[PDB]
């Protein structure tokens, strides 16, 4: 009546068509298989925390965080430097303010520590 066509530039030079969608899925699965073949008994990814999303819109939702904290790791009963060797992602810049999020993470860490089998250095 509206329409805006951004074809005033030399658009025909930069046209990326993703024919390799099927090729790149295979490529990532081969990558995962290789990583799991090198990291044999371990999962494939670090233990990630539970986290509340920002903004009025999404604060209903609970999502994965980057890492726990020095606080959540200490309350679980271990050190940050040792947590990384057991494959627990640690976030130094994140803060602890909500009690429900805190306790959920501590129990996630505690249940993780019961389920694991750490190998000795010998």
């Amino acid at each position: 009546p509206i329409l805006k066509n951004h074809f005033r530039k030399h658009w025909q030079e930069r046209v990326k068509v993703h024919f390799d969608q099927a090729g790149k899925k295979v490529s990532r699965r081969n990558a995962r298989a290789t990583r799991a073949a090198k990291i044999a008994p371990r999962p494939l990814d670090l233990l990630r925390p539970v986290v509340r999303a920002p903004t009025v819109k999404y604060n209903r939702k609970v999502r994965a965080g980057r890492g726990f904290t020095l606080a959540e790791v200490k309350a679980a009963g271990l050190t940050a430097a040792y947590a990384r060797t057991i494959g627990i992602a640690v976030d130094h810049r994140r803060q602890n303010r909500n009690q429900e999020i805190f306790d959920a993470n501590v129990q996630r860490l505690k249940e993780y520590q019961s389920k694991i089998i750490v190998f000795p250095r010998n």
């Binding site: 999962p43 990814d45 670090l46 233990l47 993780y112």
Partner: peptide, 8 residues
């Protein structure tokens, strides 16, 4: 350790 996208 994270719940996967997709269907198992």
């Amino acid at each position: 350790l994270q719940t996967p996208a997709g269907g198992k």
